[PDB]
């Protein structure tokens, strides 16, 4: 079963392709509509695997350098192995001597396609956590934040260096450990500073400090300071917003680590309570009279900050990414904080983006502590300054990648001229990554001269991810995968069967959304639809000009429905959310694995009823019944909807009565499953408990030339069916 194949290969290699059988020619692949792409998770959970301790072993050819893997042929009685990527003959290292057909090195076992090595680098660095705190918020808020901060500080490894920077009208860089007096360096929150200027001003050398010190050495002091922290003194006049130098504080923090611990794992964590009002990075005026830019404002070109403000953060983002540091943004305010302009920082460095109404909410507190989740060995499930390299067989080339990363612009034979997303490279830097971090790598078939050697068997791709494990341990994660080549003029079938509609869907949504940012407007829906049609035309069963005859193999049948939900999703239809929300959703979707990605594109709706166990039901109004309870799970929120009948039974009180044991259960059933998700899911979803005619039914109802408009899946399928056949 292909479904087992898909599952098995994702569980083993944290990989998922659009096609699992590739076209031996560039032409037929071009007209295969969905490109040979893969959703790739470099640190996919895999406890069944030992971290085998030793160097990886690489091909001796300089331009190749692949990692010895199960695809390489081995001549034991001659201590040689042939690189499956460039055929180069290679010798084994001395310690391998014993190697034999029946007792071979792990890296060569299929079970170990995907294995982790333990580099003996040398500099065992401690993790660095830099808190960049905003102080312009109500005491309730700042107090909660202060508490959340203390909590994290207690989860940090004793060797981890911690640094504190607070800001408001001005920016303060706290010198910790400094006992008896407690001091700090203050800068105008009105003007920038280079990592140099700051190094000089704060009086630091070149390349622990008084600013970043041991957790097991500062604990007391820092927790005291954190606790004594009070909101920005400078009073705010009526009709005005606080003077918050968010943009400068970040710049000072980025620079602080740039001149102290460059090129090494570290999280710059900036918590904000409102928008930056005193540039650079300024996001909006200080006079309440003016509302923060909207999606309409920004389109009517009536957003005078957006461009400058974003230009600022982008620069910071690239510095930090280039210095190998992560930037997180925890924005909690009743109104926009400027995420849209700041998005590139957590988007480019593998950082987190967390939205909220206030830090004094379970929503936030919960989310923030999930950030410091420990693994089975009490180590953060964090990875730092990862470097991802991807080798391909000579018949394949790398178009580009889409997801949390930055290009290392490493040219080579594997890179393709025609680039997609972050392309022109075979190497990307992912400063911050987790077991969930997933990237989208687009490939391009090469063998252009149409009818050439189909021979060689399969094509292969290798993924090498080096990173600094939270443990301080340096590591290299290696994955090598191979899929069979096929002659499309004799195997269209064997190829079409390999389609992975779910993956394909997401992969395309990723390209569609990447464009949505790019200089491209609503021509997205346009291109997306054009493709859907082309796919139906090449892989659908049908007689020309006979819509009623159109039918899809069960291998494709859901692709159409996926697109249907994508094109009408908040991911491409921004105008119903704030520029900030829009950025927040896109941030998470371009990260997520195939599973979560799907829920994000097409919410799951389960129905509960006295008549049978909970069963997923169509994301249609038809699914909304009077005697049924619904649990709609988009990724960002969990909603429970009580149908009319059940709403009355519930407003009537039957639940308390001992006679209606079951009813009381029914009401609870969906609530219980929402509790699990409300812990398991990382960005903790917003919760909603509504019912027939509730003020919040809206949240459910709403979720339930151009190829079409805001219509129904049926109409959509109709207009679709007819265009596919002509």
């Amino acid at each position: 079963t292909y479904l087992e194949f898909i599952q098995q290969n994702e569980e083993r290699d944290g990989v998922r392709f659009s096609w699992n059988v590739w076209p031996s020619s560039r032409l037929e692949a071009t007209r295969m509509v969905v490109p040979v792409a893969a959703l790739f998770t470099p640190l996919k959970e895999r406890p069944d695997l030992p971290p085998i301790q030793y160097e990886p072993v690489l091909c001796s050819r300089t331009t190749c350098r692949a990692v010895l893997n199960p695809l390489c042929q081995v001549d034991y009685r001659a201590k040689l192995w042939a690189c499956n990527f460039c055929y180069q003959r290679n010798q084994f290292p001395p310690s391998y001597a014993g190697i034999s057909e029946l007792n071979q090195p792990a890296e060569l076992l299929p079970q170990f396609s995907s294995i982790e090595y333990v580099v003996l680098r040398g500099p065992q660095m401690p993790l660095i956590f830099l808190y960049v705190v905003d102080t312009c918020m109500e005491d309730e808020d700042l107090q909660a934040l202060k508490e959340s901060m203390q909590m994290s500080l207690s989860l940090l490894p004793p060797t981890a260096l911690v640094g504190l920077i607070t800001f408001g009208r001005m920016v303060q860089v706290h010198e910790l450990g400094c006992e008896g007096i407690s001091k700090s360096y203050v800068f105008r929150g009105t003007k920038d500073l280079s990592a140099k200027q700051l190094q000089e001003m704060l009086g630091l050398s070149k390349v622990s400090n008084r600013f970043l010190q041991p957790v097991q050495k500062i604990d007391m002091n820092l927790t005291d300071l954190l606790g004594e922290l009070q909101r920005d003194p400078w009073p705010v006049p009526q009709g005005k917003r606080p003077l918050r130098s968010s943009g400068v504080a970040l710049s000072i923090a980025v620079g602080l680590l740039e001149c102290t611990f460059p090129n090494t794992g570290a999280r710059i964590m900036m918590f904000i309570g409102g928008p930056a009002t005193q540039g650079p990075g300024m996001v909006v005026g200080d006079e309440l009279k003016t509302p923060i830019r909207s999606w309409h404002d920004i389109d009517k070109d009536n957003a005078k900050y957006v461009k400058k403000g974003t230009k600022h953060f982008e620069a910071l983002a690239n510095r930090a990414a280039t210095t190998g540091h992560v930037i997180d943004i925890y924005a909690c305010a009743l109104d926009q904080t400027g995420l849209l302009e700041m998005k590139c920082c957590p988007n480019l460095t593998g950082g987190y983006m967390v939205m909220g109404d206030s830090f004094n909410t379970s929503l936030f507190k919960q989310t923030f502590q999930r950030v410091f989740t420990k693994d089975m060995h009490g180590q953060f499930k964090m990875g730092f300054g990862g470097t991802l390299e991807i080798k391909t067989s000579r018949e394949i080339k790398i178009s580009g990648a889409i997801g949390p990363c930055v290009s290392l612009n490493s040219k080579g034979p594997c890179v393709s001229e025609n680039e997609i997303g972050t392309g022109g490279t075979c190497q990307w830097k992912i400063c911050g990554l987790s077991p969930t971090t997933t990237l989208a790598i687009y490939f391009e078939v090469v063998n252009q001269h149409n009818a050439p050697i189909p021979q060689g068997g399969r094509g292969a791709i290798q993924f090498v991810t080096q990173y600094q494990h939270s443990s301080g341990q340096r590591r290299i994660r290696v994955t090598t995968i191979a899929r069979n080549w096929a002659d499309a003029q004799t195997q269209i079938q064997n190829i079409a069967a390999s389609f992975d509609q779910e993956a394909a869907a997401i992969l395309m949504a990723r390209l569609a959304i990447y464009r949505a940012e790019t200089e491209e407007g609503p021509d997205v829906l346009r291109w997306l639809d054009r493709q859907l049609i082309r796919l139906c035309q090449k892989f659908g069963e049908y007689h020309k000009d006979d819509p009623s005859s159109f039918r899809f193999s069960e291998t494709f049948s859901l692709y159409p429905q996926f697109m249907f939900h994508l094109r009408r999703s908040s991911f491409l239809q921004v105008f119903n959310n704030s520029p900030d929300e829009s950025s927040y959703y896109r941030h998470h979707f371009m990260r997520q694995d195939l599973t979560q990605s799907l829920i994000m594109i097409q919410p799951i709706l389960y129905a509960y009823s006295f008549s049978g166990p909970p069963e997923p039901v169509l994301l249609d109004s038809s699914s909304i019944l009077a005697d049924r309870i619904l649990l709609m799970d988009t990724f960002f929120q969990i909603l429970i909807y009580h149908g009319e009948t059940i709403a009355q039974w519930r407003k009537s009180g039957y639940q308390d009565m001992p006679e209606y044991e079951n009813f009381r259960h029914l009401l609870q059933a969906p609530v219980d499953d929402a509790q699990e998700i409300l812990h398991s899911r990382f960005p903790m979803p917003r919760y909603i408990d509504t019912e027939h005619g509730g003020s919040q039914a809206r949240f459910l109802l709403s979720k339930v030339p151009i190829l079409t408009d805001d219509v129904s899946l049926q109409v959509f399928m109709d207009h679709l069916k007819k265009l596919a056949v002509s």
């Binding site: 007096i181 001091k183 203050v186 800068f187 105008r188 003194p233 400078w234």
Partner: protein, 767 residues
């Protein structure tokens, strides 16, 4: 043979000392500043507040021009008045405020002639008639004495104060009490010489003696603290911190105060936190290895902090060396040999950058005054570091090559003294006159943006502003010349007040009267300041020429117009100017108007400033040191020995002398100096047994060491700066310096040579 200084000072003490001086007559000539008499107001201002170069002005401009006697006044608005003399009164005219002529705006003083039954008072300065406001009306009586007179100070006294109404205040709102900001240079130099600890430890004691009116129980003056070295360290000392906070601002150039609340607190309320900080600062920078420091940013910062707390203030800056760290006001080591006739010599005395003058203006604009305690040890460019503090009305204290075991007491005495000084804030002095002449020039630690208002961020009891007048029209030998000084300021309690000084001078068309009423001490104070200001504008040889020619011109005029016929072989000098030549020669011999061979620019700049602020008492002594013989001292039954001429001729190998100019105090010892004395004073048996390098206070001694200590005290008494003692052993020792103060000897030319010079040009003016 001329009437020496000592004889002149003594004769006046004889005939006028120990007697009451009632300022009831108009152009009345007062005793010399060197004479101790009791003064009772009674109409015209006390000579302690204001003296003049002549108490009888020439009637016309041409007359004045013939004589060339500068008409000016030395004014010390807040001069300390003796305990045994009556204090000023505080007049409150209510809502309206003080009554003033509508035309020239002169205040209600004894110079207002009440007419028409006392309904309209004609003003004595411009002759305009005014309407005695309702509430102020009062019946005249026999010749108009108003039946009020002796009851109301403003009507019968020369000096007194008015309560200022809100329209006398900035932004028409009650000002706030001032604040004191201590800024300590903690770079290496001052950490090593143990100055930092000194200032911190000693500051814990003195912060208590901070001034406060009797009417209140605690001082309204708040305090602030700062340390620095090319970077500023502000401190938060709010009355609720168990520990003081520290905020470092490294953005010199575009400086700013990182606080408000926690910076400028009540020393009482935040006592324990401040001491806490004061114990700490010394250790805190103990290992500092920083040597370069900034300056302009510091003044910049304090001023800013004050502007923010919206209150006037005074910065007590403690600096050590030439500020070299890059930042605005960066000072180089530009000490050049551009003098003696360079015509460009002036630049040596002006500040390097154009920033200091600006900073000074901003300070004055915000009632910020800066007093600087400088402990140099090498060139420091005083012409730059002392501008803001001069223009701002502050005080400049220099301690060359500071050494703890010697200078500790001198500096601490200065500091205590300077903190307890009676001071007014954010003041502006205006000198109105009667019809005919007007104030046209000012000299003093002041700043002026227009041509009538003398702005003093801070003014104290020692500071004296000198005002030159010029003829505007013609004066009446009948009405004479009136003068009304008025200083508006803010008190340490935060009150807007006005201090008034009225003075009636005589007028005349007769040259005899002009001279008969001159005061040499006054005239010298003017010439000194006048020339000292000119240094920044004309070649010194140009200044010296004007001084000499004006001196010869004055005497020539007197000779050809007043002096009874006498032989051409004689040189006539009016009694008013007996000792003028001597003193004038001293000014010309002074280092500020002299040159290069020895004496650092730093020393010239320093003196040039110190004098600019002096009153008559001060300038008299500064230019003609007081030389007391100590060996011939009457044992326990003393009262300060008689002064001896400032010549080496009056020294004896067997004697021991005391020479003081108000700044330096030399103890000269001759070789054949009696071992008896050298014992009861330095506790060592012989002359060769004393070490100069050990100029510290010598106690013990029962009859003499005590009697000498007595006089040293009485000498320092009325003197603002605490003198630096320096022991000199006769034959070839440091004595070289000492000889400089023997102002009558040649050292320029001797007193006799100069006299001989003047006579030549007086003869040249062939008449």
């Amino acid at each position: 043979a001329m009437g020496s200084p000592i004889q002149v000072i003594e004769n006046d003490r004889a005939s006028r000392g120990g007697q009451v001086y009632a300022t009831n007559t108009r152009g009345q000539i007062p005793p010399l500043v060197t004479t101790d008499c009791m003064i009772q107001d009674q109409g015209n201002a006390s000579p302690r507040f204001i003296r003049c170069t002549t108490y009888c002005f020439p009637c016309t401009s041409d007359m004045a021009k013939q004589a060339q006697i500068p008409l000016a006044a030395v004014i010390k608005p807040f001069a300390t008045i003796p305990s045994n003399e009556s204090p000023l009164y505080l007049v409150n005219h209510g809502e309206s405020g003080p009554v003033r002529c509508n035309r020239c705006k002169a205040y209600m003083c004894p110079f207002m002639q009440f007419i028409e039954g006392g309904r309209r008072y004609q003003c004595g300065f411009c002759n305009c008639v005014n309407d005695v406001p309702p509430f102020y009306f009062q019946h005249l009586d026999h010749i108009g004495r108003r039946l009020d007179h002796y009851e109301k100070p403003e009507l019968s006294l020369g000096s007194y104060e008015y309560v200022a109404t809100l329209d006398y205040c900035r932004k028409s709102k009650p000002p706030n009490p001032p604040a004191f900001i201590f800024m300590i240079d903690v770079s290496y130099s001052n950490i090593k010489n143990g100055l930092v600890k000194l200032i911190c430890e000693e500051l814990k004691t003195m912060l208590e003696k901070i001034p406060k009116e009797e009417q209140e129980e605690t001082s309204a003056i708040r305090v602030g603290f700062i340390t620095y070295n090319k970077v500023l360290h502000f401190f938060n000392v709010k009355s609720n911190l168990a520990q003081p906070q520290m905020m470092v601002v490294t953005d010199v150039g575009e400086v700013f105060v990182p606080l408000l609340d926690g910076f400028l607190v009540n020393y009482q309320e935040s006592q324990s936190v401040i001491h806490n900080l004061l114990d700490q600062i010394p250790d805190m920078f103990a290992d500092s290895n920083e040597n370069e420091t900034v300056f302009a940013p510091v003044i910049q910062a304090g001023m800013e902090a004050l502007k923010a707390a919206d209150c006037p203030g005074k910065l007590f800056i403690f600096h050590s060396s030439l500020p070299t760290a890059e930042a605005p006001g960066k000072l180089k080591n530009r000490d050049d040999k551009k003098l003696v006739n360079t015509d460009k010599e002036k630049i040596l005395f002006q500040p390097q950058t154009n920033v200091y003058d600006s900073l000074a203006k901003d300070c004055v604009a915000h009632g910020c005054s800066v007093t600087l305690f400088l402990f140099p040890s090498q060139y420091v460019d005083v012409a730059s570091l002392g501008l803001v503090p001069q223009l701002t009305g502050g005080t400049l204290y220099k301690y060359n090559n500071f050494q703890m075991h010697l200078d500790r007491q001198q500096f601490l005495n200065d500091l205590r003294n300077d903190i307890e000084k009676k001071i007014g804030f954010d003041a502006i002095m205006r000198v109105r006159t009667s019809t005919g002449f007007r104030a046209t020039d000012f000299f003093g630690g002041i700043l002026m943006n227009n041509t009538t208002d003398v702005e003093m961020a801070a003014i104290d009891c020692d500071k004296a502003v000198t005002v030159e007048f010029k003829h505007d029209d013609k004066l009446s030998e009948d009405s004479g010349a009136l003068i009304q000084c008025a200083v508006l300021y803010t008190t340490i309690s935060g009150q807007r007040r006005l201090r008034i000084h009225n003075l009636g001078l005589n007028c005349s068309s007769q040259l005899a009267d002009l001279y008969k009423s001159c005061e040499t001490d006054a005239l010298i104070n003017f010439f000194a300041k006048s020339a000292f200001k000119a240094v920044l504008h004309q070649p010194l040889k140009v200044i010296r020429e004007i001084l000499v020619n004006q001196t010869a011109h004055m005497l020539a005029c007197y000779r050809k117009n007043c002096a009874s016929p006498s032989a051409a072989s004689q040189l006539i000098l009016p009694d008013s100017m007996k000792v003028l030549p001597v003193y004038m020669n001293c000014l010309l011999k002074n280092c500020v108007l002299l040159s290069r061979p020895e004496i650092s620019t730093d020393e010239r700049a320093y003196q040039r400033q110190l004098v600019m602020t002096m009153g008559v008492a001060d300038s008299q002594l500064f230019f003609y040191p007081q030389l007391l013989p100590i060996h011939t001292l009457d044992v326990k039954s003393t009262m300060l020995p008689a002064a001896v001429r400032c010549s080496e001729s009056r020294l004896s190998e067997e004697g021991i002398f005391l020479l003081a100019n108000g700044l330096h105090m030399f103890l000269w010892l001759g070789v054949s100096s009696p071992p008896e004395l050298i014992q009861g004073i330095f506790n060592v048996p012989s002359f060769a047994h004393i070490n100069t390098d050990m100029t510290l206070l010598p106690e013990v001694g029962n009859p003499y060491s005590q009697q000498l200590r007595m006089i040293m005290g009485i000498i320092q008494q009325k003197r603002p700066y605490s003198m630096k003692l320096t022991i000199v052993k006769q034959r070839e020792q440091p004595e070289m310096v000492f000889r400089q103060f023997l102002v009558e000897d040649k050292g320029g030319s001797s007193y006799v040579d100069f006299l001989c010079c003047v006579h030549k040009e007086i003869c040249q003016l062939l008449n």
